[PDB]
Amino acid sequence: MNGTEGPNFYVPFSNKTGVVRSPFEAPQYYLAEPWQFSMLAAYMFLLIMLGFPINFLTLYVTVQHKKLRTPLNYILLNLAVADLFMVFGGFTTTLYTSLHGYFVFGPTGCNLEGFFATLGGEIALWSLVVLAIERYVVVCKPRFGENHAIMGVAFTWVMALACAAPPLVGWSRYIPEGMQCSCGIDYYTPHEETNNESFVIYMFVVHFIIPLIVIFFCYGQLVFTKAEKEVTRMVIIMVIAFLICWLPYAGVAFYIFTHQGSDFGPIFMTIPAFFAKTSAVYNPVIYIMMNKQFRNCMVTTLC
Amino acid sequence: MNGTEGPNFYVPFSNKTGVVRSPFEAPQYYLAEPWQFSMLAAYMFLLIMLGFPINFLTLYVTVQHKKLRTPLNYILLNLAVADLFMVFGGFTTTLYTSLHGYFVFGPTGCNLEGFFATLGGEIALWSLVVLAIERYVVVCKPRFGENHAIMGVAFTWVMALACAAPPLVGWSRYIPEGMQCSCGIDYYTPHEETNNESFVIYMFVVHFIIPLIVIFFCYGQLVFTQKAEKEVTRMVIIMVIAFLICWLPYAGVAFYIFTHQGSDFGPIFMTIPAFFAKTSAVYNPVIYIMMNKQFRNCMVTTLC
Ligand SMILES: *[C@@H]1O[C@H](CO)[C@@H](O[C@@H]2O[C@H](CO)[C@@H](O)[C@H](O)[C@H]2NC(C)=O)[C@H](O)[C@H]1NC(C)=O
Ligand SMILES: *[C@@H]1O[C@H](CO)[C@@H](O[C@@H]2O[C@H](CO)[C@@H](O)[C@H](O)[C@H]2NC(C)=O)[C@H](O)[C@H]1NC(C)=O
Ligand SMILES: CCCCCCCC/C=C/CCCCCCCC(=O)OC[C@H](O)CO
Ligand SMILES: CCCCCCCC/C=C/CCCCCCCC(=O)OC[C@H](O)CO
Ligand SMILES: CCCCCCCC/C=C/CCCCCCCC(=O)OC[C@H](O)CO
Ligand SMILES: *C/C=C(C)/C=C\C=C(C)\C=C\C1=C(C)CCCC1(C)C
Ligand SMILES: *C/C=C(C)/C=C\C=C(C)\C=C\C1=C(C)CCCC1(C)C
Ligand SMILES: *C(=O)CCCCCCCCCCCCCCC
Ligand SMILES: *[C@@H]1O[C@H](CO)[C@@H](O)[C@H](O)[C@H]1NC(C)=O
Numbered sequence: 001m002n003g004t005e006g007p008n009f010y011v012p013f014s015n016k017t018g019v020v021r022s023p024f025e026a027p028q029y030y031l032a033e034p035w036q037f038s039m040l041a042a043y044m045f046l047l048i049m050l051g052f053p054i055n056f057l058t059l060y061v062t063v064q065h066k067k068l069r070t071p072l073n074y075i076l077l078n079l080a081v082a083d084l085f086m087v088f089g090g091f092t093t094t095l096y097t098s099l100h101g102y103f104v105f106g107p108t109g110c111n112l113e114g115f116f117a118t119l120g121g122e123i124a125l126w127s128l129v130v131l132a133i134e135r136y137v138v139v140c141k142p143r144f145g146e147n148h149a150i151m152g153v154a155f156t157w158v159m160a161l162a163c164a165a166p167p168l169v170g171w172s173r174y175i176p177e178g179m180q181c182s183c184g185i186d187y188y189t190p191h192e193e194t195n196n197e198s199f200v201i202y203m204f205v206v207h208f209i210i211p212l213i214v215i216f217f218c219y220g221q222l223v224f225t226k227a228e229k230e231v232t233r234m235v236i237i238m239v240i241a242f243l244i245c246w247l248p249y250a251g252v253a254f255y256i257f258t259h260q261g262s263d264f265g266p267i268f269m270t271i272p273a274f275f276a277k278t279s280a281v282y283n284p285v286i287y288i289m290m291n292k293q294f295r296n297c298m299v300t301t302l303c
Numbered sequence: 304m305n306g307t308e309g310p311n312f313y314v315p316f317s318n319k320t321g322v323v324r325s326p327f328e329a330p331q332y333y334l335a336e337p338w339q340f341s342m343l344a345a346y347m348f349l350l351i352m353l354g355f356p357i358n359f360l361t362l363y364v365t366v367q368h369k370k371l372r373t374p375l376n377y378i379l380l381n382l383a384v385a386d387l388f389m390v391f392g393g394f395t396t397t398l399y400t401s402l403h404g405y406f407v408f409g410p411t412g413c414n415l416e417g418f419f420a421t422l423g424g425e426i427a428l429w430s431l432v433v434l435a436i437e438r439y440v441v442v443c444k445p446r447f448g449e450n451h452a453i454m455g456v457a458f459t460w461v462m463a464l465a466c467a468a469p470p471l472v473g474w475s476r477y478i479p480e481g482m483q484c485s486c487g488i489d490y491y492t493p494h495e496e497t498n499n500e501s502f503v504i505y506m507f508v509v510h511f512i513i514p515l516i517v518i519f520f521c522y523g524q525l526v527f528t529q530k531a532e533k534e535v536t537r538m539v540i541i542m543v544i545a546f547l548i549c550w551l552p553y554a555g556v557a558f559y560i561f562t563h564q565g566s567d568f569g570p571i572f573m574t575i576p577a578f579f580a581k582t583s584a585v586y587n588p589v590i591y592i593m594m595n596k597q598f599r600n601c602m603v604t605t606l607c
């Protein structure tokens with residue numbers, strides 16, 4: 001083992017020189033210089049200051065205009081709400097933690113940070129499953145209305161909770177990653193008390209592989225068989241954007257899980273874990289660029 | 304209006320073609336196919352056949368093991384009893400109604416179905432209030448013993464009855480919903496003779512918002528402020544999440560209807576949330592078995 005395991009942490013830094021301290025107890029300046037922590041904090045402050053207004057405006061515009069009741073409108077409303085939970089529930093702790101160089105709030109802070117990021121990301125992935133099914137139904141006509149869209153929304157919360165909630169209550173756990181200023185699922189230790197290995201397999205199979213199978217089956221039907229075209233084009237970009245956002249994180253996580261205790265440093269997981277937090281802001285940006293009706297309503301409300 | 308109001312019903316289907324019939328008089332096949340009603344009957348049959356044994360077993364194990372006398376144990380015992388009232392008092396009517404496609408038993412059957420589902424759901428909500436307060440006292444130490452647990456049990460019945468009973472006796476009313484095979488509070492019509500509007504505000508304020516405020520206050524105190532206690536605290540968190548999954552869709556659709564009476568919605572709109580919510584009779588003992596090691600071990604001992 002090239003790192004330092006504690007009761008509730010795994011620091012990717014050897015304690016041969018005795019300098020490692022718990023990320024719930026002291027600033028982690030032995031593994032990165034203070035200016036690097038400041039860069040994480042500046043980045044998180046930007047995400048909060050952009051993420052709050054752009055997601056609140058999306059929610060507000062949608063509620064104000066009764067014309068905006070297609071399945072796409074409902075799903076983007078759901079994403080805006082989930083993004084606001086990410087921003088206020090999790091990113092406020094990421095910011096405070098990055099400012100101080102460690103989880104001042106202790107494991108409770110780590111739980112907040114990990115839970116709301118996992119919940120928000122999985123709401124997005126299962127939302128794409130709903131949109132992929134909706135596009136397949138509408139285009140391939142094997143009708144998907146408001147009732148199905150709302151049932152789709154409720155479905156995304158249930159699936160996301162089934163992924164994000166168990167590590168709060170004893171199946172796996174949230175644990176600091178990288179420079180120790182964000183938390184994720186424990187890919188790092190066997191920790192039999194929380195049955196870590198089975199949760200990670202469950203997460204990658206049920207909450208990553210199975211959704212992508214559905215999405216690409218639906219896409220394969222679309223391909224290998226103006227208003228609707230605009231929606232289909234937007235969903236294509238939402239799926240591409242999702243993979244850009246989360247595949248680096250998913251790949252590094254899976255590497256760690258299959259290479260536990262190997263020689264990797266703090267920057268290895270820091271970059272993908274923080275890049276993935278752009279998930280709280282990018283979907284409304286795509287929405288504005290690629291949906292004429294929503295863009296016009298937004299300009300109408302804002303002006 | 305986009306539906307059809309009768310003296311004691313509101314069908315979410317237009318009578319512009321003359322086909323609408325009272326859900327107390329004839330099968331409702333004009334608004335859904337017979338196979339759709341049969342799916343409701345199959346679902347209700349499963350809930351009864353799972354609901355009776357899992358709740359009876361929870362009751363039996365608790366009574367047969369004097370070690371199971373913590374506040375959590377009393378509250379889960381109370382939920383088991385309330386679940387059994389839901390299963391035999393209400394769901395047997397839901398099943399018979401779904402088999403035939405209308406309330407063969409008339410308004411009396413509608414009252415039974417609505418009353419026992421409302422009572423059961425409200426016993427669970429107010430039970431979560433009791434548990435949230437117990438966790439607050441225990442973890443934040445600002446002592447909660449057997450006396451307080453039993454007092455909490457009696458309190459949940461009083462509050463739940465204060466929600467479920469008035470529509471039996473003239474304040475609001477129970478009325479069929481969706482495909483007309485379950486009944487709920489009258490969100491649909493003004494019906495001033497039963498003062499419908501004031502009851503709905505009372506129900507959403509006293510019997511939804513206020514409990515939730517107490518629960519999240521107690522939780523917030525816990526967050527911004529041993530192993531045995533952690534296990535109980537973890538289970539209560541999951542009980543609250545499960546309650547919200549079960550009931551928020553129904554509450555949201557009900558509140559939408561109340562604020563948009565006569566708007567254009569169909570029978571499927573309330574059918575799915577109202578029938579999904581009936582899982583409330585089953586899921587709490589399932590959490591209990593999965594998240595309390597002492598109870599699960601007692602159950603194995605009893606069963607084997
Ligand atoms: C890294 O190694 C150091 C040195 O062995 C650990 O610090 C010691 O911890 C023991 C047990 O608490 C104390 O009795 C010693 O006084 C500590 N020594 C010093 C110099 O502080 C330290 O705990 C290790 N870090 C981690 C995270 O395990
Ligand atoms: C829906 O409309 C039909 C047609 O108007 C109603 O049926 C009539 O009801 C009146 C009053 O009971 C009778 O006198 C007529 O003989 C009925 N006509 C037919 C063709 O059946 C029906 O009552 C309406 N449904 C509801 C629920 O109001
Ligand atoms: C569809 C558009 C997709 C756009 C996005 C494409 C992302 C490509 C990269 C994925 C990360 C894979 C991570 C694999 C990790 C292997 C690392 C490794 O072997 O490193 C050993 C070393 O010890 C470590 O410090
Ligand atoms: C785990 C619990 C899951 C949920 C269990 C809920 C209760 C059972 C549902 C029965 C279906 C009855 C109605 C089936 C209707 C199918 C057709 C339909 O939805 O049509 C919509 C229409 O096209 C307008 O948009
Ligand atoms: C904590 C975990 C929570 C998990 C569960 C989340 C549930 C989300 C669903 C909400 C339903 C709200 C109903 C809103 C009604 C909108 C109605 C509408 O605009 O459409 C009317 C039309 O008539 C239709 O056919
Ligand atoms: C900054 C904090 C983060 C990234 C914390 C947790 C994130 C996860 C556990 C992400 C899981 C995944 C998601 C949301 C979607 C793609 C696959 C996944 C299972 C790696
Ligand atoms: C299947 C039959 C049902 C769902 C009948 C009635 C249910 C209610 C009137 C439920 C009311 C509420 C409960 C129990 C808890 C959440 C809030 C609420 C007031 C909508
Ligand atoms: C309504 O009357 C007109 C409102 C026009 C608002 C346009 C303001 C855009 C200003 C630039 C914002 C950039 C933020 C992102 C930086 C990375
Ligand atoms: C630690 O790193 C060394 C060097 O790469 C490697 O040989 C060793 O297997 C690693 N330890 C573990 C447990 O993987």
Ligand SMILES: *[C@@H]1O[C@H](CO)[C@@H](O)[C@H](O)[C@H]1NC(C)=O
Pocket residue numbers: 304305563564565566567
């Ligand atoms: C019936 O539906 C139409 C179409 O949505 C709407 O214009 C009308 O206001 C509705 N009626 C009522 C009473 O809401």
Ligand SMILES: CCCCCCCCCCCC(=O)O
Pocket residue numbers: 248252267268269270271272275
């Ligand atoms: C402008 C786009 C930049 C793309 C950055 C991708 C970030 C994740 C890269 C993973 C590196 C690592 O394994 O540490």
